[PDB]
Write a protein that binds this DNA or RNA. Sequence first.
RNA 1: AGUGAUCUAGAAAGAGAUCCACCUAUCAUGUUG
Lengths: 144, 91, 386
Amino acid sequence: EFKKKIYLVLKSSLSGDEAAHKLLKLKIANNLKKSVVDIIIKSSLQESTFSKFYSILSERMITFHRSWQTAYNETFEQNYTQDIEDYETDQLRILGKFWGHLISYEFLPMDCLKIIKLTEEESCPQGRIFIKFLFQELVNELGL
Amino acid sequence: MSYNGIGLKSAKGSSTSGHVQRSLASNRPLAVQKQIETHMEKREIEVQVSELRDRLEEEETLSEEQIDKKCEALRAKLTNEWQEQQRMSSL
Amino acid sequence: PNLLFSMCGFEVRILPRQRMEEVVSNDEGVWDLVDERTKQRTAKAYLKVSEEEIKKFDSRIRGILMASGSTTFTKVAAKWNTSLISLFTYFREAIVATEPLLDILVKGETRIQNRVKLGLNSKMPTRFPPAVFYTPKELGGLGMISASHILIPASDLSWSKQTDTGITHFRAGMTHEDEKLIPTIFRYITTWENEFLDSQRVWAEYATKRQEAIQQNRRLAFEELEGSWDRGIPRISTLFQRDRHTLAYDRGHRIRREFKQYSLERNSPFWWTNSHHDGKLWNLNAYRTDVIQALGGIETILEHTLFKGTGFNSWEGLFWEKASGFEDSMQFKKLTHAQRTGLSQIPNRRFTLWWSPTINRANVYVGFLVQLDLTGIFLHGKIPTL
RNA sequence: AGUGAUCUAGAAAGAGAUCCACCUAUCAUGUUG
Ligand SMILES: [K+]
């Protein structure tokens, strides 16, 4: 029911500002914020492509309060450390562009990339494909 | 009716309640300085002459001409001492 | 610093990045222009729907209301859907920042619902919960698609006319007493920018697979392109269009389709796309699923209907005979104009009966009880079709 | 670090002529060499 509620908040909004406003007005408890970010990520991964709607939504949540920023920080490291093995190449494309966008504007600090360990043992094809899309977005937005 | 410029003129004809919510999502010493220093140095001489003038006038003992003479003498003395000091410093 | 133009109904404003005071992230409706030499984003193109196109949409809604004086409730809702889908699938992300269009969408959707309400001689809000209009056709609802249950951006109009004020406030759109968020059509249509970027991707992948397929002297298998089939502009699936051997000769098809406006009184609102050449450019099947969830599921929806009184075993067997009825047997016969106009009452009667527990609910604002002759039924208002 | 801003609501008598979103369609050949 909580997943449904958040999902319907997303699907009933025209813009990321509206979606962010509705979620913020829910006054979600601090322990549920990470699960809300997880629902937002999974919803964005159901789309056929990336969308600026999710980046704007996340950005407005992050800047509203520090508890949202930390929920996004740990959701990023959660995705790279545990969830990437469950993602197909389409989902990895969307996810890489999403996190690359948030990093490219410092909503997620570039220090979050400290968890990346480019080696033949501590990385997998899912993670390397994810890194590829993330950096591709970084170069497209910022330039070399 | 609007509040702080936000709302609709009226809810009538809008097909909505008109309810407004604040968005939670939005949140070489430049020659001119040397000229001022030189002016201040010459001014100190003229300040001493004026102070002497003030003392002599307040004592109401000397005519305006005698006071002018004593001021010109002090001016000449101090100007000569200054020219000698400038010649020595430049030397 | 801004270069402006209006083309094909889109209002466009190009602002180079080098001219911006600060570069801020944007929502859908602001295209990023990439410099193909550096592969870097160098300018933003803000989009809006032109005032002329906004007026054309409003005129199409007016045309529906003016024509549908004796139309069935389902055909009125279907016309609304056709116009709404035409608008959204054509303009997409340009709608996001066009506030006058959101206002017109709210009014249009309300007027379409009012046509049904007035057809039932009652505008009483509690008599028409969202389930009556948005429940899919297969569950006896009108199957309307919503775009106006969103929050409309609001900001000081004085400042808004001089500079971009952002979105500091929201004003309500369509609303209902029930605590439920109806999905908005826009969330189910991929924006044009994303379609174009994904198209460049899938078609470059296809070009590479095509060259390898000939290097191996193979043929590309139908499921060697699975996952890309429903992607690209044109859709990858068009490569295997059944009549492609004839359609290879179809030239000037876009201008021909647009010029149809001068030779045919009734034209498709999808004048801009040809499914033979472009493929299926949208898929709204997920909207029906999510609207059922938004309404509280089948259980909650059916609680508003006469379903329990039918004694029908399961909601699964609820197959509406959408292809036969008395009015279908009668439409061919020799009938007067009065007899033909009177046939539309039949499906309206079925619709009203299905939702009758809600249409004749006791919790109404005003309403003197009138007992129905020879029955113990009380009508809380005068509703002839019921 | 989360305050405020909430249209609507039915009766009588007349009227009404229709058309376009919309369920993914490669070898298998007996023998004679
Ligand atoms: K008459």
